[PDB]
Amino acid sequence: SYIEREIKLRVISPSLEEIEERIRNNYTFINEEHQIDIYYNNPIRDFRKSDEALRLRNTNGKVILTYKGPKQSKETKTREEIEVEVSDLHKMDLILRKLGFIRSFQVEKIRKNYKYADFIISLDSIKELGEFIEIEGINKTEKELISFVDEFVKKHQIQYEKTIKSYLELLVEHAKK
Amino acid sequence: SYIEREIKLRVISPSLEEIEERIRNNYTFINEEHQIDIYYNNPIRDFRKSDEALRLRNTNGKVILTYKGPKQSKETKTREEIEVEVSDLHKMDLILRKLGFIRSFQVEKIRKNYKYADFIISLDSIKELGEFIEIEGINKTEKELISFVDEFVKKHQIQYEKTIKSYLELLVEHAKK
């Protein structure tokens, strides 16, 4: 198991395209990912009450099953994460459903990944939710991440609102407004 | 989903090595597989009561997650089977355990696979259980399989006892004798 530590920002200003223009010359483009995620629940453990997640992700055709444990921080999005690649999305979904998991909600996004000195900056355009940025740390501290996010938003004059809610939780908040 | 239909024979006579000698010249060797299987239970659904199975198999280093539904026949071993290859056995096991599945029993065998006209004949040497043969049908009927198994055992003068119990169930019967 590994510990994912990331900070998610709802972008208010400017546009992500404008933000890419601003970072393009000092941040190294990695790739663009079209990610379609299916989330699952289990009738025994409410993954809403225990703060867990189960996801079957299709990212540019690669299929990834991920477990996410409860949040460990209130200042960043910090969770245990265990992932495996699987050979077939339909069959993995079928297995989960045969085992009694139920399909909950689906998240879809386009994500543009950049790299700047052990930090991954992901520009996310979320279907129905809007434009966000995530920053994840490789071999980093909560304090080192909070300081980089702060230098990042200010160097590129971004107006943002930080959150530790997941995209799944955010989507549900959005559906009923 | 696909329907697995196979017949398992406890070999009484002769030795599997003697049986391979007898089939070697008319059956085409496919491969040998060293298979280590972990089975799982779920505290909600007793996979013993519902007749289901969940397996994480390591076969010659390839990792396969398989769901098996209830038996559909009393004359052959017939079950729904859904399988995916996964990238990492330890992480898949960790995910299953984080989700609440519990490791039940482990089956280990050496399996020698041969092919003779749409039939797969698997010579199985099962740790602690002994020598068995499975015959699985590709695009076949219960009747076509029952007839081939019968021609197989007689052409090669095998003394056998057919069973539709799984190797998991058989192992448990063996442990308490």
Ligand SMILES: [K+]
């Ligand atoms: K994420």
Ligand SMILES: [K+]
């Ligand atoms: K089998």
